[PDB]
């Protein structure tokens, strides 16, 4: 069982959670791994089953009983006849909180136990795909007030192609290759761009051009469809002071949601579970905005403030970079749209972690993603240790579905 | 493809193998079943070690297989079959010291290795003669502003001798008073090792800037102490370049970060006391050193004196002062012409490096969360560089506070 200290305040806590990890992660003794972005039979099902009904019965404190003695019985009835089963809605409802609880990287799970779960697993085509991401995005913008939600499609099946969203995001901005091989609008959706275009999209070019979704049903072509201007969002980027900033004619959307994660519960697994929260600000103002594979806005803004770009060490990489961040904060602020800064996230999930410390003994956390692209020591998780480790229920990366 | 990590940079979309990691031959902490990456601490035996560093040694040199390399082998284990121990040649001490350097995961000015001014004090016998390496060394490192790198390496531990230490985490670091009050003034990291040199006489100042004195101990005495005379301390008052106020503050920084009580482990010997130094990255005064809540603690401060709200965690106050604070760093330096590297320039050097040693060894190890800069991080290019961490002997090591 590791040790782990935090650094600013010299306290100490054991992490005894992390024994209950089942899958590996990349790292040996030899060498770490743990900067790397992605990860280079019925008896096997049926304990993770198990373990997954017997974390549902503890939770609702009827572990034991005969609700539980008979869902187990159920459970395995089921896959010993199909060599599968289904989940109950509350079941899958923990489930889902459990998978965002589970994740190392999400810096916002003091958030975990409020989340509204749409089960969608009665969907037999793209168009209803499309119903239901269009009924979340409704119930999850809330005009500004963001709220929390998951729509969970049907579980993946031996016998047959997967359900899948191919965006990303459910709200992205397009990416058009030009002839001076620049990219205009955002670098990191060219691919899916492309996709869009060779599916019979008409697209348009400007920088924020908000994509359509490509929704696929199992073993069938994927099928385009447009989001109605009014569910997306969007907020116009203004400064506090400097009154030319909103000139740049800079915006981002309201809403983040992933949608090609498969979530996995009791063994099953879920190829389309589209979720979304609200953005922390350093999302948006530091790498959406200053990556340099992205919308590499850095230079334009700090020559923008007359900053001397001839040197590095006037720092004014980072001074731009600040503004930025600023900028995104008080248009969220003005616009009434949920924000949330890095001060205040990490501070959040620092509570967190002596919440899970106190009621699981642990929390599985991974520390280059956890401490903010700015300012990383000016928050206290900088100086806070973390152990990194994979529980179930997951969210997991999946292949691309082309 | 190859069974070795692929490592992937996520700007550029380039790819590489590590295959220098299959060198390894000390085990970190992490397991499959979980990472431990973000922990600030995670005669038999001697031979292997040894014949492994001497096998280095005629690499570097291109004599692999000679009679010199064989001889030198042969001649390793009959001092180690009679003795327990062996001795570095002079050459052998130069190259194993760099590659210490070369090797370790957590520095990211590596691009400057094998520029590394190696002081052989093997001789050393007191701790009044440490005192006199030590000045030199400060002399040498110093030179007036232009800084060199530099190390000095003292007597290797002994079967059933004591080791030669130095108390001191740094040949330079500022006096951390406890305060009645409960609060500290000066350096709070230094209470300890303040706290030992009053203990052993040092008549103590009340600053927040008093450089401590040196606490130096030679094999199975108790540590003598030594003041350093401040023309040999090169300090840096900190004013900014815009900000008239700033220099009111009296903040300074001496030039000279040098690391006194880690091991240097080279071929099975262990060298307790051998300190090393180099010159400054801006982020580790302007960020770490001013700005932690647990050090000098600043940020509200400054804020203050440039009327930012400190009430509201979204005016982002705290990265506004951070900013200003490491400016005046760099500013301040770079006036008083004393050698320092700001923090981009320092990563995109680190980039040249990682490439360099792919083409040279197949690969660096390397520790992401020390690497990347406590400011502004992913504007830095190692943000988007994945990497590999690993244990290469040579190797620094930290070890247990002799007290
Ligand atoms: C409520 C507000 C939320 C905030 C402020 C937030 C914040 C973040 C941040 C900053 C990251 C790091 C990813 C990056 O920067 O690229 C992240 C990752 C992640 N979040 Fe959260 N999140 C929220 C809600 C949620 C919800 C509702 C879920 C699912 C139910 C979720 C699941 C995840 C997962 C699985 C990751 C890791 C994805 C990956 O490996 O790229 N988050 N989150
Ligand atoms: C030449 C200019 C140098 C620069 C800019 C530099 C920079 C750094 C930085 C930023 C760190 C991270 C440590 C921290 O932030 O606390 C570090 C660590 C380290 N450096 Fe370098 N360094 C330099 C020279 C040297 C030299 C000459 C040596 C030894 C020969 C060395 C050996 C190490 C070691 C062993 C560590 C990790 C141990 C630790 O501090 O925890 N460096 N360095
Ligand atoms: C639900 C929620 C709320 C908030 N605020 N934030 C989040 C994280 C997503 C949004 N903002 C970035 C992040 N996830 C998007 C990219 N992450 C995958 C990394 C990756 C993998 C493979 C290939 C690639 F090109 C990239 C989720
Ligand atoms: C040679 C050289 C040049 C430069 N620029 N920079 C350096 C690193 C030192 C200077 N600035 C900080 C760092 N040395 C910090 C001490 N080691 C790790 C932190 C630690 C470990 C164990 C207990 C603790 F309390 C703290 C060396
Ligand atoms: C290579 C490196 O692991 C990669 O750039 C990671 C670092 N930390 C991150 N942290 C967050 N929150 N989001 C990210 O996309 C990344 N990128
Ligand atoms: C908890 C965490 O491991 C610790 O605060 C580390 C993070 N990265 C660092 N990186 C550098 N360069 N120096 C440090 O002291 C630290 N501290
Ligand atoms: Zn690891």
Redesign the pocket.
């Known amino acids: 069982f590791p040790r782990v200290k935090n650094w600013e305040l010299g306290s100490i806590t054991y992490d005894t959670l992390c024994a209950q990890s089942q899958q590996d992660g990349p790292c040996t003794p030899r060498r770490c791994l743990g900067s790397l972005?992605?990860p280079r039979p019925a008896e096997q099902l049926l304990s993770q089953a198990r373990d997954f009904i017997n974390q549902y019965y503890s939770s609702i404190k009827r572990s034991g009983s005969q609700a539980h003695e008979e869902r187990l019985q159920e459970v395995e009835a089921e896959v010993a006849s199909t060599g599968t089963y289904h989940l109950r809605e509350s079941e899958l409802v923990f489930g889902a909180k459990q998978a965002w609880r589970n994740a190392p990287?999400?810096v916002?799970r003091i958030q975990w136990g409020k989340l509204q779960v749409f089960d969608a697993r009665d969907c037999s085509s793209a168009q209803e795909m499309f119903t239901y991401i269009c009924n979340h995005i409704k119930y999850a913008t809330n005009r500004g007030n963001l709220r929390?939600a998951i729509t969970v499609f049907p579980q993946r099946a031996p016998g047959r192609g997967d359900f899948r969203i191919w965006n990303?995001?459910l709200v992205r901005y397009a990416g058009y290759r030009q002839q001076d091989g620049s990219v205009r609008g955002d670098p990191?959706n060219v691919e899916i761009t492309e996709l869009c275009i060779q599916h019979g999209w008409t697209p348009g070019n400007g920088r924020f051009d908000v994509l359509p979704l490509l929704l696929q049903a199992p073993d069938e072509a994927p099928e385009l469809f447009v989001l109605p201007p009014e569910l997306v969002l969007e907020v116009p980027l203004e400064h506090p002071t400097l009154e030319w900033f909103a000139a740049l004619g800079l915006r981002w959307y309201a809403l983040?949601?992933?949608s090609n994660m498969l979530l996995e519960i009791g063994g099953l697994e879920f190829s389309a579970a589209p979720?979304?929260?609200?953005?922390?600000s350093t999302?948006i103002g530091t790498?959406?905005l200053c990556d340099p594979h992205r919308y590499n806005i850095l230079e334009d803004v700090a020559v923008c403030m007359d900053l001397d770009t001839r040197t590095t060490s006037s720092l004014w990489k980072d001074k731009a970079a600040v503004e930025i961040n600023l900028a995104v904060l008080h248009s969220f602020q003005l616009a009434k749209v949920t924000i949330?800064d890095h001060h205040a996230a990490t501070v959040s999930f620092m509570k967190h972690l002596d919440n899970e410390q106190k009621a699981r003994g642990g929390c599985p956390a991974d520390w280059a993603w956890i401490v903010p692209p700015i300012s990383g020591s000016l928050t206290p998780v900088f100086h806070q240790e973390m152990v990194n480790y994979i529980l179930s229920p997951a969210f997991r990366?999946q292949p691309d579905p082309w």
């Open positions: 972005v992605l990287r999400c916002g929390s990303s995001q990191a983040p949601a992933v979720f979304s929260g609200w953005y922390m999302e790498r959406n949330v990366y």
